[PDB]
Write a protein that binds this ligand. Structure first.
Ligand SMILES: Nc1ncnc2c1ncn2[C@H]1C[C@H](O)[C@@H](COP(=O)(O)O)O1
Ligand SMILES: Nc1ncnc2c1ncn2[C@H]1C[C@H](O)[C@@H](COP(=O)(O)O)O1
Lengths: 521, 521, 52, 104, 52, 52, 52, 52
């Protein structure tokens, strides 16, 4: 509408209703010029890290984490009072575009505003591109509204045949400039809307009952079972008389049960105290990647993490597995640490009711058929797929964790829930791509057909606004005694947690999931 | 509406009516970038000065003083002809936004206008933030319309537990970027309106009667009192016969009176001549803070000043207390002075009719019950709360003093009038916050998740307009002889007072309250 | 309710302590009085309080 | 605070789970009301309201300041009412009388 | 109670001769009389408390 | 009963009333093995913070 | 807290008596009245609108 | 109720349900109780053996 009329306003508040909650948040962004305006293929030949793909001049907005949309208090209101959450709808607006040119003179970069330069944005609704926004990577809006963030570059991996870099004819190249977009100058703004597809409420609560205990402790079953094949408390000695008996209260392991615990993939168990672990190199002939659980896909090992939902140790416990998401702590620095105390560990142990433990077996299954000569033998079950009449509970969302994921387009799925967490969707919120339209430098006076490789060095900046209507379910239980809540117990602190410190830095002190309220099976 | 169309006009005049007066005033402001766009917590551990809180990138408009809205003549018209004043309504407009960028090159700062940069303003109507605008601090619009002022930074103290800095979980952090605002470019303008809640007229007048004299000097009371317990003029000698007598004109101390004087908190009395005072250190083991009257709140001493309304010495008197507001004089320089003549002292002595004196006791109350053996004993009363049938008059407003204050949200209040002066309000005029939206510097070409700490150095400037409809009450008295007025008696002056001097500097020569017209109880 | 203590005088003249009518030490001084602008004034009847 | 090593009559006291028979020699059994959240606006019960200057000093006379153990309400005074409790009473009857102040 | 006792310090308690009003305080006004006055004028002032 | 929902802009998490009792031989706030019901702890109504 | 209702960054336009003498010891010094501005960092001397 | 580990002891996840906290119907010798219910659509139990 003009150079001197702001194209949008700062919206960033969350409004609550009994049925639903609507969280708006706005941030400021800065978009550089990636790869000097030109695509580049990527690849490296690694034994299991082998990849290939392209890197594009474009960059995109990643909205997928929960703290983008929720302040800690708004996350406290949510998980304390409510059993379920699912997004109803989404809306996005990009405005206050400002395109700058930078000119280095005598080693001095002097930024000067450039009015006629443009920027081009398109949202891919048809899902015609590789979708990287749910991969669980960086680049999301910052947690804290004052911080200003740098729009991430967009590049996409492609099918790897074997352990080798080299592409075959099945590989694909997507030129983001082959899609119609919208070119914006400093007065223009971009806006889109989205409607989530109906998806089951994430159930935020812990079960107050265990599967094997679903019975009535007072009564007995009318069923009968074999109690013992011989008299006496010692094995392979006695009079060898089969003793049948009624199933009576007080023996609850022998009850006949209608349901089974969830699937398992056993994980390795590592101790946080460095002296207890067995010494495993980082990479080499015998490496940690080998001894962790990994699926072999086309001769390329890949860890299974977090893997299927399984009960895990408590956060403060002295062990952990790959089944536990790990987040950086407040005191962590520089991509590496030798002590686990700095780190913040996801823990699933609330699902220990319906699910097996990650570092422990699903059970033990009779290996042979005994007779008077042959003693029975029973093997462990490290991996068990789903069976009829099996129940399990999905991995929990986290305040730092991702909101959604894209269900890969394929012939078949089973129980499409993202193993990291969140909401599996067929048509996830569309990625939104943005780049700085190239401005050529001073051309030659003569003519030459070769493309022009000299450009004005630019970058742009502006605002972005996100609105997601969430739908929730109020807890409606008859529980008498007080339920657990998420409270700040931090106590006396030299500096307030969940707030900037003396130097202005904002970090998130602790990782907190959504399951507090109890419910019963 | 455009870069080349001014968004507002300069309104700055006061229009009078018999019922009401409407004072408009406009100023020019300059807003820097505070804390390099980032919040910072604050705190220090002091014995009684201990505080904690945050400092924010935002800044705000403080309209709360009287000379912001009134020229000295307009203040003379007001207090001379009128018994009462209360604000009816308020209106505020911010316009002519101009955002500048500054670039230092070879030690030379060169300011250049930046059109596309924005500024974001919101008024907090819901009172969802700490309210600092009434604390009686600096940053208000200047008295003199030509001066141009610097918008103050916004930061807020928070609850201090004990004498220690350290925060507990009761403390709160408010992110001003979590509120919806309005982003303004050089063509946009901001406007809001406000309606004061009905509040009692400030009574500007002095009483022409004393409480104890409310009677008729000619007549007598039909009441009787005990005149003496013995004959003779000497104590503890006589014939010890109780003498009852009628209350007769000429003895006015013994009259039976329907009302009582206002509350007291005694203050210390200090002499302006330095030789008369007792030598008190500034800080140490025995310090002036200890010997002044102070309430102990959670082991933290705090002066009681001005304290409850109490009669005070005249301005030119040779004594003063903390009950008298002190303003800087024309000749004062540099935050400290060794002579009181420079300073300008508030004086309440007009309320000496209904109120006790600050440096003197409320009275003397009989300590024991005498008999023939025991002589009566009477102690002083240094502190007296309110009693039934007690009357007092509130502290006076001043031309330099504050207009209003916010009644703290709490379970209970008593007589909510600000002890400094002005109008206690539940919902005071909302604070208006403003900041410069950050513009990032030249980003790196690669991607990095850490927030961007390099920004373009900017500041903005523009105009602000304030309109407050005041409601007044014309004096309607039958007094015969001439009332006192506020006149300029300054006489022959080398330079006009209440006007700029040869160097252009504008100062306020003398402090003048609102109570001149007399009235009767 | 609130209190302002009062002096207690006996109707039998022998029990009271001998107080002059006016002088250096006078009955006005020993009764409860509020000091208003350097002028003593009795507080009577004073706030409501139980009496004999 | 409830776990603090001191208490006054300003703190309501409720019987604990382990208490028996109308008397106990140890406070651990008992459950103590605590108001310390109102330490923002209110003075502490076991500590004075403040200290008020007793005399008027001069070069000869040193200043003297007495404690204030009891202070009624003054203009422009704020306080916060005592908290309700899950065991505490819901209401009370304002006694019929000529006058009240802040009937809570 | 004037002080805070300990094993060494005995408690000390002073009298209260004057007490203003407190929250939750009740009192009853002085009685009218057949000889007493009917009314009075509330003095025009910034503030009052319980104008009786 | 009539209530007022909290409407604050506070950022960091407020304090809540939660059951922290932890591992217990017998559930608190519930009958014990002998059927007796007692209230384990006294808890007031002030948790959410607000500003003056 | 009441006494903290102010803005920690700014100062008051009010002035107060800082000391009646030089030096950190009581009843010794040159006995000169020192008036000063109320500046951030001394929060006990602020002029406050309300009482506890 | 939920058992944590191999031990009896309850944790704060456990729940207590008081059946007297639900509204009921109190019946004397003349009163009677009646309710109705509609099963949700569920696949036919297939009663037959396969011949292949
Ligand atoms: N995350 C997620 N996305 C999509 N589909 C899912 C997901 N989790 C489970 N399911 C499927 C599997 C269940 O049979 C069914 C429950 O849908 P109901 O709505 O409960 O009837 O939905
Ligand atoms: N400054 C201020 N703000 C709010 N309330 C106040 C103030 N001063 C006194 N009051 C209260 C106390 C009086 O009983 C009443 C007079 O209101 P009237 O209007 O005279 O009937 O209002």
């Amino acid at each position: 509408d003009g150079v001197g009329n702001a194209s949008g306003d700062w919206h960033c508040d969350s409004t609550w209703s009994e049925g639903k909650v609507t969280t708006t948040s706005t941030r400021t962004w800065v978009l550089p010029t990636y790869n000097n305006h030109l695509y580049l293929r990527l690849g490296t030949t690694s034994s299991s890290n082998t990849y290939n793909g392209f890197s594009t001049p474009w960059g995109y907005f990643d909205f997928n984490r929960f703290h983008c949309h929720f302040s800690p208090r708004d996350w406290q209101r949510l998980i304390n009072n409510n059993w379920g959450l699912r997004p109803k709808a989404m809306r996005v607006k990009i405005f206050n575009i400002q395109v700058k040119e930078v000119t280095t003179s005598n080693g001095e970069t002097t930024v000067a505003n450039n009015l006629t330069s443009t920027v081009q944005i398109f949202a891919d609704s048809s899902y015609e591109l590789p979708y990287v926004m749910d991969a669980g990577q960086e680049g999301s809006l910052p947690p804290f509204p004052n911080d200003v963030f740098m729009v991430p570059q967009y590049g996409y991996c492609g099918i790897v045949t074997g352990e080798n870099q080299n592409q075959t004819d099945r590989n694909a190249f997507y030129c983001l400039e082959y899609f119609p977009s919208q070119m914006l100058r400093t007065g223009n703004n971009f806006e889109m809307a989205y409607n989530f597809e109906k998806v089951p409420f994430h159930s935020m609560y812990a079960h107050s009952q265990s599967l094997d205990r679903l019975m009535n402790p007072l009564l007995d079953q009318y069923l009968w079972h074999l109690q013992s094949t011989t008299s006496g408390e010692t094995l392979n000695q006695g009079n060898a008389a089969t003793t049948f008996g009624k199933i009576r209260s007080g023996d609850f392991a022998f009850y006949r049960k209608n349901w089974l615990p969830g699937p398992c993939v056993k994980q390795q168990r590592f101790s946080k105290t460095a002296s207890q672990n067995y010494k495993i190199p980082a990479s080499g002939g015998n490496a940690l990647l080998k001894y962790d659980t990994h699926y072999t896909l086309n001769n390329r090992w890949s860890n299974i993490a977090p893997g299927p939902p399984m009960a895990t140790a408590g956060p403060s416990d002295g062990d952990f597995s790959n089944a536990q998401l790990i987040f950086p702590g407040p005191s962590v620095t520089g991509n590496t640490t030798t002590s686990a105390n700095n780190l913040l560990f996801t823990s699933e142990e609330e699902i220990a009711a319906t699910n097996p433990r990650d570092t422990d077996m699903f059970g033990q299954i009779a290996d042979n058929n005994q007779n008077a000569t042959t003693a029975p033998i029973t093997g462990n079950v490290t991996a068990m797929g789903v069976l009829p009449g099996m129940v399990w509970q999905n991995r929990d969302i986290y305040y730092q964790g991702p909101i959604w994921a894209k269900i890969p387009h394929a012939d078949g799925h089973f129980h499409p829930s993202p193993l990291i967490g969140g909401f599996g969707l067929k048509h996830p919120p569309p990625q939104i791509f943005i780049k700085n339209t190239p401005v050529p430098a001073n051309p030659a006076t003569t003519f030459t057909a070769a493309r022009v490789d000299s450009f004005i060095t630019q970058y742009s900046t502006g605002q972005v606004a996100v609105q997601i209507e969430w739908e929730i379910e109020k807890e409606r239980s008859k529980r008498w005694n007080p339920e657990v809540q998420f409270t700040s117990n931090y106590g006396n602190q030299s500096s307030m947690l969940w707030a900037p410190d003396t130097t202005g830095k904002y970090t998130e002190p602790r990782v907190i999931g959504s399951r507090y309220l109890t419910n019963h099976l």
